[PDB]
Amino acid sequence: LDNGLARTPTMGWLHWERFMCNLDCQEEPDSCISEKLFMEMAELMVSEGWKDAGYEYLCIDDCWMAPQRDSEGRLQADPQRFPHGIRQLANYVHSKGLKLGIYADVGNKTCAGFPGSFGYYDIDAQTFADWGVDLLKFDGCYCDSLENLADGYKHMSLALNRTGRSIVYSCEWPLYMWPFQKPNYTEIRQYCNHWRNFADIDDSWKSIKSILDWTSFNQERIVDVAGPGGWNDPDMLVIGNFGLSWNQQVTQMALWAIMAAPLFMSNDLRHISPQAKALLQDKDVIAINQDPLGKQGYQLRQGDNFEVWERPLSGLAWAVAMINRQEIGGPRSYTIAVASLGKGVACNPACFITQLLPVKRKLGFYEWTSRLRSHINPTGTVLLQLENTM
Amino acid sequence: LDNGLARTPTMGWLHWERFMCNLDCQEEPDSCISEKLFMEMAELMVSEGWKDAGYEYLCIDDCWMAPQRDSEGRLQADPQRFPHGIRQLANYVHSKGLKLGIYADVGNKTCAGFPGSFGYYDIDAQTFADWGVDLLKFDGCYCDSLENLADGYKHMSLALNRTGRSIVYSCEWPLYMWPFQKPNYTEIRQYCNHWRNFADIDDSWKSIKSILDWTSFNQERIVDVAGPGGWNDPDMLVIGNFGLSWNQQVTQMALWAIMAAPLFMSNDLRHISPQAKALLQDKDVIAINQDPLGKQGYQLRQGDNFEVWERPLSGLAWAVAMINRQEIGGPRSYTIAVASLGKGVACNPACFITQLLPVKRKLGFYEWTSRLRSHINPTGTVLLQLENTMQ
Numbered sequence A: 001l002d003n004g005l006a007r008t009p010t011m012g013w014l015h016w017e018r019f020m021c022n023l024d025c026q027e028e029p030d031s032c033i034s035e036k037l038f039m040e041m042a043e044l045m046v047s048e049g050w051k052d053a054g055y056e057y058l059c060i061d062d063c064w065m066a067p068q069r070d071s072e073g074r075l076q077a078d079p080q081r082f083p084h085g086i087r088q089l090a091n092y093v094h095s096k097g098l099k100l101g102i103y104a105d106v107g108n109k110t111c112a113g114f115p116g117s118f119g120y121y122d123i124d125a126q127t128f129a130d131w132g133v134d135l136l137k138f139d140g141c142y143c144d145s146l147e148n149l150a151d152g153y154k155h156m157s158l159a160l161n162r163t164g165r166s167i168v169y170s171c172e173w174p175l176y177m178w179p180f181q182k183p184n185y186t187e188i189r190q191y192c193n194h195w196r197n198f199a200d201i202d203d204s205w206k207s208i209k210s211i212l213d214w215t216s217f218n219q220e221r222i223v224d225v226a227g228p229g230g231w232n233d234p235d236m237l238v239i240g241n242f243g244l245s246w247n248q249q250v251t252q253m254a255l256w257a258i259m260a261a262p263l264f265m266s267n268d269l270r271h272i273s274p275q276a277k278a279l280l281q282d283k284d285v286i287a288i289n290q291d292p293l294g295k296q297g298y299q300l301r302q303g304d305n306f307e308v309w310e311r312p313l314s315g316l317a318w319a320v321a322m323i324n325r326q327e328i329g330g331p332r333s334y335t336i337a338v339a340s341l342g343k344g345v346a347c348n349p350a351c352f353i354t355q356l357l358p359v360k361r362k363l364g365f366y367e368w369t370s371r372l373r374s375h376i377n378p379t380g381t382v383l384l385q386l387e388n389t390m
Numbered sequence B: 001l002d003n004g005l006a007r008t009p010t011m012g013w014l015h016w017e018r019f020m021c022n023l024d025c026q027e028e029p030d031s032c033i034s035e036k037l038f039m040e041m042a043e044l045m046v047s048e049g050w051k052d053a054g055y056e057y058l059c060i061d062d063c064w065m066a067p068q069r070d071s072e073g074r075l076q077a078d079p080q081r082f083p084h085g086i087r088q089l090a091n092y093v094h095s096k097g098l099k100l101g102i103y104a105d106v107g108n109k110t111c112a113g114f115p116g117s118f119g120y121y122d123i124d125a126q127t128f129a130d131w132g133v134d135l136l137k138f139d140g141c142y143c144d145s146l147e148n149l150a151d152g153y154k155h156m157s158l159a160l161n162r163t164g165r166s167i168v169y170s171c172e173w174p175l176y177m178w179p180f181q182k183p184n185y186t187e188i189r190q191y192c193n194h195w196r197n198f199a200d201i202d203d204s205w206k207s208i209k210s211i212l213d214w215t216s217f218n219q220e221r222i223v224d225v226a227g228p229g230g231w232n233d234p235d236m237l238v239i240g241n242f243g244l245s246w247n248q249q250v251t252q253m254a255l256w257a258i259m260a261a262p263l264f265m266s267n268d269l270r271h272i273s274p275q276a277k278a279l280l281q282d283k284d285v286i287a288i289n290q291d292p293l294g295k296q297g298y299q300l301r302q303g304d305n306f307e308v309w310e311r312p313l314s315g316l317a318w319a320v321a322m323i324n325r326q327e328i329g330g331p332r333s334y335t336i337a338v339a340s341l342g343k344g345v346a347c348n349p350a351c352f353i354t355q356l357l358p359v360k361r362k363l364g365f366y367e368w369t370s371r372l373r374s375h376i377n378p379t380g381t382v383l384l385q386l387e388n389t390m391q
């Protein structure tokens, strides 16, 4: 969606994975989804410098709305959990330098059941716009056919541009056309800032493995249409939670970087490890994901419970990922042909590789002939940045 | 196996999971299985107080032997990787206050391929005994039928006791009778200090889940025959490695404690996290696993992605585990009937519960009536210790 937005992958926070749809504010006020929750996370994003690092979007997922439209027919924030209403919330958020994102839905209901947006797109768009929203995650649950679907998506898209307000549009469009017919990604790109491809994500290594495995076994259709304006969105960064290990979390960050993926955390920034905050704010890595160019990386090598991913950056520089899929044993060692890496380019004839994950080290120079060897921790990853002597 | 050994679960170290069968001492030496490696690991077990915490057995798994028997017909440590034969190593190990454990095999070959022990049990036993071994992990790969198998196990058992040397006998016997007939566990208990049940283990949460789930859905046959002399062995503690998250590692330790399981680490005590060393050496937990009584815990409750496990200890005290199987979301909260927990016992009249994992806290006193409530992290666990009093 060429609306001059997301000219780099989007970076923010989304409550879904960490908080799902929690409403028992009686016995669980702190996990309970309420303007108080977001009101807090927002303060923090500024506090421990999340804004400073790159995350700027505070987005609300499903379960923020009240049972049904108002007299006028518009949507409404739950009376009890969102008394002051989005506008005022957006205001605060803005007051603190951030941008507010909201959840919607093309069908008759959100996946949560709350009101849909069928035959409301227009009304809704103006409402969000009016409210002062900055991003809309348009979910796709509940709708007859692709007819109603595909059109709902394209429609709402136009609606928004219409309102005049600059709103990042996150579609879940593809995810739903599967499995009925591969979607015409080029088209979808003309209506969305970024879209979902594979299912949702659990705070589990399995879930991450699968996402990579699927995205990998499909770069053909997706890896291409990626670029400024529209990106492929795997799903939130579940780093900071509990299901992942050290070598597992780095993998996710490292690889989300390689896939020029939207960086959306989903954890509790109130109680998050320092070791993890470190990773998530790693200037060097955020920098690779935020590469101005906008060329989505991809999987280069397979075999030997080893995966080699690479992404071309700006200025004859490339970023390479080394994932070790061997669930057991110790840290193995992989060695390849420096030459045949950056599509022949980077390292031709001078490369200056510097480990950037898990330890930001400074490896020497590498000639076209040179061979690169690095040990990789189980379920771990090694992120490198190659520079050409030019 | 009533040989006066393992009157409490065995605690030690086994290279398998962490080092598997590494032999390229040319381009991967630190992973390379050599007398050099163990020598180091042994020094450390004393250094960072692993001995002090409870681990006392330094055991060598498969791939320690040389291609084939010597002239005499005895086994022999690989010439290159184990120059000083074994014995001396045993001596260095014995020096550091530790005990040496070795890998063998009932069939014609070890799962690695190296020499077996078929029609050698006797010779081999005397050899190990002579070498100064303290524990034998008898693996069961390569053998015609249960005939050769079941007898190989029972035989070697006697052989060892014969040698006169006090040797812990770890059998992988059951793991092999399936697919044929559930093992006569009571019989196996008459020949082993502890045995393997379910398959091997990966540095993965999946692998741990499965072991628990398989074990859970089987306590009927195993949970019982467990006690001093013989225990059910799930497999090495993969804590300290990389496949497990924090909340995930506690689960493993907490639950190995509940299953009066042999505690055998399999990690590199050289580059191991402090946060992890802490857990593994937790005096309080090691204490529960090492409970003198010897009553294996079990799974008590199921449903709605929550598991409640409990184990009776000594002195009207029980240990309870709270696993949250929900792979996603945030930390949920579980609440139960204090009364209906320690089989009704613990908490009659009073109970003094103290969280011991993941944070060793001190919860107040609980009456039989009382209700206990605790939040649990995804794939995590909460280990509690209930004491019976009457304040």
Ligand SMILES: *[C@@H]1O[C@H](CO[C@@H]2O[C@@H](C)[C@@H](O)[C@@H](O)[C@@H]2O)[C@@H](O[C@@H]2O[C@H](CO)[C@@H](O[C@@H]3O[C@H](CO[C@H]4O[C@H](CO)[C@@H](O)[C@H](O)[C@@H]4O)[C@@H](O)[C@H](O[C@H]4O[C@H](CO)[C@@H](O)[C@H](O)[C@@H]4O)[C@@H]3O)[C@H](O)[C@H]2NC(C)=O)[C@H](O)[C@H]1NC(C)=O
Residues within 6 Å of the ligand: B106, B107, B108, B118, B142, B143, B144, B145, B148, B149
């Ligand atoms: C370790 O490997 C050993 C070798 O086994 C494999 O197969 C052989 C053919 C080679 O290729 C070898 O390289 C392979 O590794 C294996 O040794 C074998 O042990 C079995 C069981 O003891 C023997 O089978 C029996 O053979 C007899 C014939 O002679 C035997 O009996 C006499 C009298 O007791 C002994 O003095 C001999 O040493 C032999 O042991 C058969 O009679 C009998 O079969 C029955 O059914 C047949 C077929 O219908 C009838 O013809 C017979 O009358 C019987 O009623 C058994 O099959 C086998 O001979 C022996 N092989 C060798 C080379 O010694 C050993 O068991 C393996 N150990 C483990 C744990 O796997």
Ligand SMILES: *[C@@H]1O[C@H](CO)[C@@H](O[C@@H]2O[C@H](CO)[C@@H](O[C@@H]3O[C@H](CO[C@H]4O[C@H](CO)[C@@H](O)[C@H](O)[C@@H]4O)[C@@H](O)[C@H](O[C@H]4O[C@H](CO)[C@@H](O)[C@H](O)[C@@H]4O)[C@@H]3O)[C@H](O)[C@H]2NC(C)=O)[C@H](O)[C@H]1NC(C)=O
Residues within 6 Å of the ligand: A002, A003, A004, A007, A160, A161, A162, A164, A165, A166, A167, A228
């Ligand atoms: C409704 O839909 C219409 C149709 O798409 C939108 O119209 C677009 O409006 C945006 C608003 O900014 C226009 O964006 C501008 O595009 C220029 C074209 O450059 C592009 O291509 C070059 C060459 O490859 C790239 O180098 C460059 O990155 C762009 O991808 C840009 O040059 C403009 O520059 C921006 O960045 C520079 C540098 O920092 C700044 O100096 C500028 O101020 C600016 O921020 C800018 O991106 C776009 O051209 C319009 N498209 C069309 C087809 O007309 C409406 O915006 C939309 N309405 C709403 C409310 O969203």
Ligand SMILES: *[C@@H]1O[C@H](CO)[C@@H](O[C@@H]2O[C@H](CO)[C@@H](O[C@@H]3O[C@H](CO)[C@@H](O)[C@H](O[C@H]4O[C@H](CO)[C@@H](O)[C@H](O)[C@@H]4O)[C@@H]3O)[C@H](O)[C@H]2NC(C)=O)[C@H](O)[C@H]1NC(C)=O
Residues within 6 Å of the ligand: B002, B003, B004, B160, B161, B162, B163, B164, B165, B166, B167
């Ligand atoms: C080969 O097998 C034989 C028989 O299976 C085995 O002999 C057994 O040795 C154990 C080891 O002590 C005996 O069990 C003990 O029995 C005594 C009284 O019978 C108990 O008091 C023991 O517990 C207490 O006493 C111990 C001894 O000092 C203390 O260390 C401990 O703290 C307790 O206070 C324990 O139950 C068992 O009775 C014999 N069995 C027979 C039939 O004699 C022998 O050890 C094996 N040989 C080798 C070389 O392993």
Ligand SMILES: *[C@@H]1O[C@H](CO)[C@@H](O[C@@H]2O[C@H](CO)[C@@H](O)[C@H](O)[C@H]2NC(C)=O)[C@H](O)[C@H]1NC(C)=O
Residues within 6 Å of the ligand: A184, A186, A187
């Ligand atoms: C996906 O949709 C796009 C948008 O229409 C298709 O590309 C257009 O194809 C028509 C031919 O009917 C051309 O006249 C347009 O110029 C094309 N648009 C662009 C932006 O190139 C595209 O062909 C569709 N993909 C598939 C596989 O059908």
Ligand SMILES: *[C@@H]1O[C@H](CO)[C@@H](O[C@@H]2O[C@H](CO)[C@@H](O)[C@H](O)[C@H]2NC(C)=O)[C@H](O)[C@H]1NC(C)=O
Residues within 6 Å of the ligand: B184, B186, B187
């Ligand atoms: C498992 O093995 C045990 C013993 O090895 C069997 O129990 C024996 O049963 C006979 C029957 O009267 C008794 O006289 C013996 O005293 C028992 N032995 C022992 C050690 O208790 C048992 O039957 C076997 N189980 C099965 C299912 O076959």
Ligand SMILES: *[C@@H]1O[C@H](CO)[C@@H](O)[C@H](O)[C@H]1NC(C)=O
Residues within 6 Å of the ligand: A106, A107, A108, A118, A142, A143, A144, A145, A148, A149
């Ligand atoms: C919503 O439900 C109604 C009631 O059956 C149906 O007629 C309508 O087509 C549905 N809308 C979509 C987009 O599926």
